[PDB]
Design a protein around this ligand. Structure first.
Ligand SMILES: *B([O])(=O)C1=[C]C([N]C(=O)C2=NC3=C([C]=[C]C(O[C])=[C]3)C(O[C])=[C]2)=[C]C(C(=O)N([C])[C]C2=[C][C]=[C][C]=[C]2)=[C]1
Ligand SMILES: [Mg+2]
Ligand SMILES: [Mg+2]
Ligand SMILES: [Mg+2]
Ligand SMILES: [Mg+2]
Lengths: 354, 355
């Protein structure tokens, strides 16, 4: 069954909802199973001597922490995990290779020629494992509400974190609290104190970058280092530069919807607006002003998708592509860039005509 | 009424003998923070500007000061001292500082001698200064007497809860505001609307979080870039972010005002902080952890600690705050009292180290 699933995930437009339907009764374990296959594929199980039992124990507990809410659930976490894996292992045109300090190489694809390069050849294995694990944790115990909702309500979580990245801090904090909750979860037992401390730091930094209030800040920092005409781009020997690359990568993965085929894009859109409408129902019941795009009476779906693709997803993918980090094939053809522009065009048509 | 004038006259000195005050209070020394908060708010007029009812004010700040533990340094007296320091630095006349005036406060304890002098109270709105004072009151609430490095190394519950990023400061702000929202008998800001209260909470949280010394050099760099630029015009007082940065630097200076005081208060605070250090070192040794620097009572190295702290932490902060022209003083050249204290203490401890 391992070969079957890994071949289906080699496609960027991985039909994940077909997988959830295929698992059916055991669909609650999709995040743990996908974690196992990807770590065996990248070889992370053998590189860090990760025991299978503790690995599976923690991530079954982790996926149990995801609620049964429309969007921020196990399937969203599985999708973001798949996206970061694809973006870091697949060949990127014109990118130079360095080591292909441990580095991974995906058994699912080899660089077709020297003109292609992989991010796995430029970022150490420890840093990439943090990105994958952070993708698994990045929305742990999401209550289906926004940060702005919690701060307006003065919810306990918002007061506990002083309104600064409420959901994202809680995700990382409660995930790591779960990790340290039982010795049967310590699958990193073969990492020393320095390596484990650094791993935790990288995971926490990756999770906190998923906050969209800091979106434009991360975008500015990434363009200064990579997309500067007078600078030498990204120095892969720099620890801070690699961290910035990983943070921008996971940001793109957490909002990959518009960068997929319209089928998957619309499915994810359906989920997130259903979560929005549940929050809007509660806002109305509490006598609070309904947040924008959260009233099921006046949806304004076209305006929501159009502004989100144009102001958030658009500039992020264009910056990531201008830096030469998107996987594709030789002009250059980029799959998700074509999907992103196609989805943006359709939603502009729906907006202008309706 | 009679005790009010005595205390307000005693606090007008930069070297306010606060330990004489705790000795005078004796049995009721636990309410020093609440008494000083009430006295300062009555002096600055914040009680009447925001229509603060006395009962809820006193209730909340008595609970707040009760939240401080009986530890050598991070206690009620430290919070009271930081509050006094920010009050002095924001109300007292500064040579060459411009005056401007949205409500603003003016301390009844002093008036600007002439137009060549200016007060921060005349340039920063009353809401932001009240936020700074309240943050000084909260800035070390429920401090357990350990360092951030100790909590992250131990994987303490607080350190895991805040993801190792400014654990103690986040805890201070969060538990202080939870206490404020714990009971309706604490809501003394009930005459502030939603926007004013949200802004006040934001300013308080930023001021509290700025006290982290891990972010010290970052705040110092931003302040030198904005204020201490030779080609720039310093601080634009109409800018919200500039005023926030000024207040953050002010409370940072207040949180470590020791070396900028007379030798008596400096050495008393040094005794407190090194006793807390030695307790943490005892616990680190019992747990088999490497003893943090200057926290082993067997090898104290007190002179090296004082000199490194003055040269690397207090020194550059005071020099940046003075170069921006925000330190209260008197014309002559300009004489700044705490600059004189700081240079005197720095010379004394450099002598103790070299000899
Ligand atoms: B709490 O949170 O507030 C804290 C505190 C501190 N402090 C110190 O250290 C000191 N202080 C002082 C002095 C003198 C005088 C005074 O008065 C006020 C004060 C001294 O001398 C020596 C000292 C601190 C803290 C912290 O943070 N830690 C300890 C850690 C670190 C280290 C190094 C660097 C940074 C940080 C807190
Ligand atoms: Mg999220
Ligand atoms: Mg997410
Ligand atoms: Mg503190
Ligand atoms: Mg303090």
């Amino acid at each position: 069954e391992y070969d079957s699933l890994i071949e289906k995930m080699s496609n960027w437009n991985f039909p994940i909802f077909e997988l959830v339907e295929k698992m059916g009764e055991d669909s609650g374990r999709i995040l743990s199973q996908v974690m196992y296959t990807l770590f065996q594929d990248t070889g992370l199980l053998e590189i860090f001597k990760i025991p299978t039992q503790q690995f599976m124990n923690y991530f079954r507990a982790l996926e149990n922490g995801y609620r049964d809410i429309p969007y921020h659930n196990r399937i969203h976490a599985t999708d973001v995990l798949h996206a970061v894996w694809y973006l870091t292992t697949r060949p990127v045109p014109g990118l130079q290779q360095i080591h292909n300090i441990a580095y991974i190489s995906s058994k699912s694809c080899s660089n077709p020629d020297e003109s292609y390069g992989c991010l796995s050849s430029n970022i150490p294995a420890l840093e990439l494992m943090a990105l994958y694990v952070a993708a698994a944790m990045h929305d742990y115990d999401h209550p289906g509400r926004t940060n702005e909702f919690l701060v307006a309500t003065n919810a306990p979580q918002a007061v506990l974190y002083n309104d600064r990245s409420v959901l994202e801090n809680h995700h990382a904090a409660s995930a790591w609290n779960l990790y340290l909750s039982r010795p049967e979860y310590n699958f990193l037992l073969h990492l020393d104190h320095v390596e484990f401390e650094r791993f935790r730091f990288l995971v926490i930094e990756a999770i906190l970058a998923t906050d969209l209030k800091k979106h434009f800040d991360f975008l500015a920092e990434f363009n200064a280092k990579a997309n500067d005409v007078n600078s030498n781009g990204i120095e892969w020997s720099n620890e801070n530069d690699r961290l910035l690359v990983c943070q921008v990568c996971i940001k793109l993965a957490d909002i990959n919807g518009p960068a997929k085929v319209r089928d998957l894009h619309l499915k994810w859109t359906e989920g997130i607006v259903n979560e929005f409408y549940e929050q809007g129902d509660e806002e109305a019941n509490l006598g609070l002003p309904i947040s924008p795009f959260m009233d099921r009476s006046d949806p304004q779906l076209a305006k929501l998708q159009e502004s989100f693709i144009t102001h958030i997803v658009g500039p992020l993918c264009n910056s990531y592509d201008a830096a030469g980090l998107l996987p594709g094939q030789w002009r250059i053809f980029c799959q998700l860039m074509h999907h992103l522009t196609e989805n943006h065009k359709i939603w502009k048509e729906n907006l202008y005509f309706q």
